Amino acid sequence: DSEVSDPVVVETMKHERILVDHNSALRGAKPINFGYLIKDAELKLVQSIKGS
Amino acid sequence: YPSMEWPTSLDIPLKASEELVGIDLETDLPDDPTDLKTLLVEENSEKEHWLTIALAYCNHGKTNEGIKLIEMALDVFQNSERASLHTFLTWAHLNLAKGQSLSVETKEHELTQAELNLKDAIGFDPTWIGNMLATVELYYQRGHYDKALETSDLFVKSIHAEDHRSGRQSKPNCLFLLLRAKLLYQKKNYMASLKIFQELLVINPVLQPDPRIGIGLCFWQLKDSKMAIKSWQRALQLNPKNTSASILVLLGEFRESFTNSTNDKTFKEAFTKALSDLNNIFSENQHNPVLLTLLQTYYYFKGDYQTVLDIYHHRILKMSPMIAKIVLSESSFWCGRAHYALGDYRKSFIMFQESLKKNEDNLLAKLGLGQTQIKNNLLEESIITFENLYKTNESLQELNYILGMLYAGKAFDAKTAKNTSAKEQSNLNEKALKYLERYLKLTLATKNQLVISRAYLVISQLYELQNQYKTSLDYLSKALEEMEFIKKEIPLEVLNNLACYHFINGDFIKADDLFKQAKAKVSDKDESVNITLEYNIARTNEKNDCEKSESIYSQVTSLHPAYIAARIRNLYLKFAQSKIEDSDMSTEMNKLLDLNKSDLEIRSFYGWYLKNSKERKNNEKSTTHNKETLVKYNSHDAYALISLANLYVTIARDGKKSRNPKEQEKSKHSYLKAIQLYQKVLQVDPFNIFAAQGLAIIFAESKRLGPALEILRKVRDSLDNEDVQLNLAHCYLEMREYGKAIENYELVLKKFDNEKTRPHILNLLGRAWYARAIKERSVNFYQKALENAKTALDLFVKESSKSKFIHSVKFNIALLHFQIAETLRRSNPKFRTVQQIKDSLEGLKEGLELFRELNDLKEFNMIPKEELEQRIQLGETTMKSALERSLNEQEEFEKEQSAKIDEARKILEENEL
Amino acid sequence: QEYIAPIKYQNSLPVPQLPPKLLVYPESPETNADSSQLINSLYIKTNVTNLIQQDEDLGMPVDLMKFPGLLNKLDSKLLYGFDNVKLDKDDRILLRDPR
Amino acid sequence: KAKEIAQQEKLQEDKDAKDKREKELLVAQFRRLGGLERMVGELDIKFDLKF
Numbered sequence A: 001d002s003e004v005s006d007p008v009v010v011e012t013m014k015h016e017r018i019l020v021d022h023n024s025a026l027r028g029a030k031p032i033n034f035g036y037l038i039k040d041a042e043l044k045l046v047q048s049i050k051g052s
Numbered sequence B: 001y002p003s004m005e006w007p008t009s010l011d012i013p014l015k016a017s018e019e020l021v022g023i024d025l026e027t028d029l030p031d032d033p034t035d036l037k038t039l040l041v042e043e044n045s046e047k048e049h050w051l052t053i054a055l056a057y058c059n060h061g062k063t064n065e066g067i068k069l070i071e072m073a074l075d076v077f078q079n080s081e082r083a084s085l086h087t088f089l090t091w092a093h094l095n096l097a098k099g100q101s102l103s104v105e106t107k108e109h110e111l112t113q114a115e116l117n118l119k120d121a122i123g124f125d126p127t128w129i130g131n132m133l134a135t136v137e138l139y140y141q142r143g144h145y146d147k148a149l150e151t152s153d154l155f156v157k158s159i160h161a162e163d164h165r166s167g168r169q170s171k172p173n174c175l176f177l178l179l180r181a182k183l184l185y186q187k188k189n190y191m192a193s194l195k196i197f198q199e200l201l202v203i204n205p206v207l208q209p210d211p212r213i214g215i216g217l218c219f220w221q222l223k224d225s226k227m228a229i230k231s232w233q234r235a236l237q238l239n240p241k242n243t244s245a246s247i248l249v250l251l252g253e254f255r256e257s258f259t260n261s262t263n264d265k266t267f268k269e270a271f272t273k274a275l276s277d278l279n280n281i282f283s284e285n286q287h288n289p290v291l292l293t294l295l296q297t298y299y300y301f302k303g304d305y306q307t308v309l310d311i312y313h314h315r316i317l318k319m320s321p322m323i324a325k326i327v328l329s330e331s332s333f334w335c336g337r338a339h340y341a342l343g344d345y346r347k348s349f350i351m352f353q354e355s356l357k358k359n360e361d362n363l364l365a366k367l368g369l370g371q372t373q374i375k376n377n378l379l380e381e382s383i384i385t386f387e388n389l390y391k392t393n394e395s396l397q398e399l400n401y402i403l404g405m406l407y408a409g410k411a412f413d414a415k416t417a418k419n420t421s422a423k424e425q426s427n428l429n430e431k432a433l434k435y436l437e438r439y440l441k442l443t444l445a446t447k448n449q450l451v452i453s454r455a456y457l458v459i460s461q462l463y464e465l466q467n468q469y470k471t472s473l474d475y476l477s478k479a480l481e482e483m484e485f486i487k488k489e490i491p492l493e494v495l496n497n498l499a500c501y502h503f504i505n506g507d508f509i510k511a512d513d514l515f516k517q518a519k520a521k522v523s524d525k526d527e528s529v530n531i532t533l534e535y536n537i538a539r540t541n542e543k544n545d546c547e548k549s550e551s552i553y554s555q556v557t558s559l560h561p562a563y564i565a566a567r568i569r570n571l572y573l574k575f576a577q578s579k580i581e582d583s584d585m586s587t588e589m590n591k592l593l594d595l596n597k598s599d600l601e602i603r604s605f606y607g608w609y610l611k612n613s614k615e616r617k618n619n620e621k622s623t624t625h626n627k628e629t630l631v632k633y634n635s636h637d638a639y640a641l642i643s644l645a646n647l648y649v650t651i652a653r654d655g656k657k658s659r660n661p662k663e664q665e666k667s668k669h670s671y672l673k674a675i676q677l678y679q680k681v682l683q684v685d686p687f688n689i690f691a692a693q694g695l696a697i698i699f700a701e702s703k704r705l706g707p708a709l710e711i712l713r714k715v716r717d718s719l720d721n722e723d724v725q726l727n728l729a730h731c732y733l734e735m736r737e738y739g740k741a742i743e744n745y746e747l748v749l750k751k752f753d754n755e756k757t758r759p760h761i762l763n764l765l766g767r768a769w770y771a772r773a774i775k776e777r778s779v780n781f782y783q784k785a786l787e788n789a790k791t792a793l794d795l796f797v798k799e800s801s802k803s804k805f806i807h808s809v810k811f812n813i814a815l816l817h818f819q820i821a822e823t824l825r826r827s828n829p830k831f832r833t834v835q836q837i838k839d840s841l842e843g844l845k846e847g848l849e850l851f852r853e854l855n856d857l858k859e860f861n862m863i864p865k866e867e868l869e870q871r872i873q874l875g876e877t878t879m880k881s882a883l884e885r886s887l888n889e890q891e892e893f894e895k896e897q898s899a900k901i902d903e904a905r906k907i908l909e910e911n912e913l
Numbered sequence C: 001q002e003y004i005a006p007i008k009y010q011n012s013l014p015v016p017q018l019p020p021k022l023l024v025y026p027e028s029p030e031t032n033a034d035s036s037q038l039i040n041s042l043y044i045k046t047n048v049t050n051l052i053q054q055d056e057d058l059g060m061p062v063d064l065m066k067f068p069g070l071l072n073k074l075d076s077k078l079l080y081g082f083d084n085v086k087l088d089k090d091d092r093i094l095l096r097d098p099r
Numbered sequence D: 001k002a003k004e005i006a007q008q009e010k011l012q013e014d015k016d017a018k019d020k021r022e023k024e025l026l027v028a029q030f031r032r033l034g035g036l037e038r039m040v041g042e043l044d045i046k047f048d049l050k051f
Helices: A007-014 A036-049 B034-042 B047-059 B063-074 B079-097 B104-124 B129-141 B145-160 B174-186 B190-203 B211-221 B225-238 B243-259 B264-282 B289-301 B305-322 B325-341 B345-358 B363-375 B379-390 B397-416 B422-445 B453-465 B469-485 B492-505 B508-520 B528-540 B546-559 B564-576 B582-593 B600-613 B619-632 B638-655 B666-684 B689-701 B705-716 B722-734 B738-750 B758-774 B779-799 B803-825 B834-855 B867-875 B878-910 C036-046 C076-080 C089-095 D008-026 D035-041
Strands: B009-013 B020-024
Touching: A007 B528, A036 B666, A036 B689, A036 B705, B009 B047, B034 B047, B034 B063, B047 B063, B047 B079, B063 B079, B079 B104, B079 B129, B104 B129, B104 B305, B129 B145, B129 B174, B129 C076, B145 B174, B174 B190, B174 B211, B174 C076, B190 B211, B190 C089, B211 B225, B211 B243, B211 C089, B225 B243, B225 C089, B243 B264, B243 B289, B264 B289, B264 D035, B289 B305, B289 B325, B289 D035, B305 B325, B325 B345, B325 B363, B325 C036, B345 B363, B363 B379, B363 B397, B363 C036, B379 B397, B397 B422, B397 B453, B397 C036, B422 B453, B453 B469, B453 B492, B469 B492, B492 B508, B492 B528, B508 B528, B528 B546, B528 B564, B546 B564, B564 B582, B564 B600, B582 B600, B600 B619, B600 B638, B619 B638, B638 B666, B638 B689, B666 B689, B689 B705, B689 B722, B705 B722, B722 B738, B722 B758, B738 B758, B758 B779, B758 B803, B779 B803, B803 B834, B803 B878, B834 B867, B834 B878, B867 B878, C036 D035
Parallel strands: none
Antiparallel strands: B009 B020
16 A cells, blocks of 8 residues: 554654755855856757757 | 032122022022012012022922912013023923823923923023023923924024134033933934033033933943943942932942842842842832832842833823833833733733833833734744744844744644645744844853753754754753853753764763663653663664564564554564564564554555565565555655555666567666666655666666766765675776775775675675776786676575576676686796686686586576587687697796896806906 | 967866765754744833733823812812922932933 | 052953943833833832722
């Protein structure tokens, strides 16, 4: 089915808070905003790759 | 000090005798004033004695007796004689209209009577000052402060205009000064008003009303309240019967119980004296709104909320239209406080609204309004009111705290939601941080009040959300340090979260110690918190006591299999150490996935497993798995998106190195889909450095090495990783920057002891040294390349790895030996060793042995095996012979030079005298 | 030119690496935004400020019946103040500026 | 003639007296969250009034 019904871990999750998950861990150890690359990759790669 | 007390005796001339009859204006006055009318009409007394007896009546608590005696007097004197008598009556009724415990219609009656008599007197004499002052005071009592002040100004200009019109001047008139000082206090021009009050003090230090009162009022408004109190105390020192000075001193006592108390005992003494003085004054001034609002304060802080409400309802409301609206606002604000304390937030809202209606600048009432809005779950509305208050109170600690917490709650809630964009999240985080840090800066600027440590906890969580965990550590340690400064017990939660912040920073020993403190602060019977604390300890000791971690993991996975993190890391540790058979691993992950198939952490662990093995399950199932994660569970999941983009990049690069029409354009399309996936990840999270690294890799594989290197440098500044260092080295190699390529290759080797990646890095070190060798014809660089390649090959056959790689490094070694031979052969003998040429001949023989083992192998087509044959039978015949020619030349060279020294020997033997 | 060593750039997401778990702090009602203790915190500082103006008369009723000679003998003199006044020190400190 | 090391250690214990009064004021309950009520409730003054 799915996994087994454990009331004692259910109340463990209620009191837990996740420091880092699988997705935030991809920010590294110090925050670097890489949003500008959205523009960069689209002027330096896509338009040069679309020459085909 | 001077005196303007009234004479306590009157002598009236008698008319039968010419002697005098004496009246004590203190005692002798009849209980009904008509008993003196008689005496004043037979002996035809002057009107001034009528006025004197009436003034005595009024100044001894019998103003009605006086108004009626001057009423009687109006029958006795005729037209112009009445002028003074009307002026008196005006000021009489004014003082009846000043009844504090009076009703509203009686006060309007007394003011009507005042202006009746004033219009009469001014008709008889318009320029008598008693009339003129009576006019401005009338305007004052009718709230027309602007008109009162301009009529005072017109009068003052007029009086100077009729002494510079009779040629003289005037020294200041105390009552015009006093009215202008009061009116300037009303216009909130406090400083100006202070000066006038101060001016009066030097002109008349026994003036009534006491100008020290106004001095203190303006000192208090100008934030020198300390001095304010002194002047008020001064006023009570000079006159203990002055009840308003007494009340001002009482207010000073309440304020000084807060400002002057050193500790708890002194505060209790000062507040108890303030309260007993309040009781003493109040039990003879029971309709004083100020004392009633003070009682309200006391009853609120004593928890007696019903009495707060009762005071408002049964006392203040009955007399509300005559209370000054600032005092009424204080009383309605306390009534709202009481309603709030009783959990009746509708009525506390109503009363904070009413308090704001009577004083729009009542700060505490507005804070209460916003709080009642919070209590009614009107969050955005409460934010509106708090921010409108912030527009003019940005330096208020309590307001910065409240707004910081409201916005922190909004940020945390936004984090738990799916549909919160990255800029919504960051804007919320930064707004809450702005407010909370301004709270901290303001609270620490003062040194009387302590920091609410909740602010430290919330700030450290917010900096979690900003990916600044050392700041989290710093702020939470400030919380713990403050707690222990006030000798308060440290919550298990703060120790545990402090240990987590220490873990994320690399201090596993401090984290271990704090997790053990947290667990030491727990009952043995409880197991909900004990599961998380056991996982925390095991997770912290993975790299230092891995045998303890695996035991804890086995216990948590056996007893409580639903605890996911323990399962994931138990399987990770046993897989990464080859402690689990690959069959039983491939079974364990499926039994871990097929019961928690929506757990995105488990899905990402599964994707990692599929990518990592690269044998049992490869890119087919990882493409389907990650697209299942996207199109069925999140579709914004950075992890699955990046794995998809990575597989697209691998198929793109393996399409770009072949020549097949339809199937080199599927590499142009796959680079584009990979770019699109990285771009979407950056839309969801612009701080995702792995998307940046993938884009940089695509930049480098379009031979755009500048941008690729700058992205890889910025990624390395936040990711201490095998791959980013390897990519930096790779990229330096492709820029012909052989020095930095070699530096970064040996760096990635000196950290990150990884055995499956080691031979490839040694082979690329060999490639870099080979590159720097052919571009300087240096045999030392060829030999550095040679040792690197030799150790790479020995490890390739230690691993038993792909014969692709072993053949490639065998070719590399043979090529290097041939290059060494051919570079030594083209060298000046003064730069060679005989033993270096010997070594190069034996190196060339071993190069040819590897070349013929590459030729007879029926699968090696990295060189055409027609170039390979020619170098075999160029190594076999000719090059060899060449390298012995340069060998024989070298030693003949060597011998020749032993020729040369001995000739020098005989020449410097020959040269003696 | 001919040394064989292929270059392979890698991105390679990590294993999730589930760090230690935080615990939600126990509720502290007196430090919420809705706490009355914040209003009390502020009251400690601003305590009785809005009461010092006892009434619309500012605690300072104007009464001409307090001036001998005036209102009975028409003696305006006492309104223009004593000349050559002494000003005791506990009164003289009250002409200072705020601080 | 440097016998004045008695009066430079008078300055330092006067400073730490000043610091002990600052600390005593910080942890005083009447200046802390919820403490003003707690201290008002500990008073032994009994108004006899009903409104």
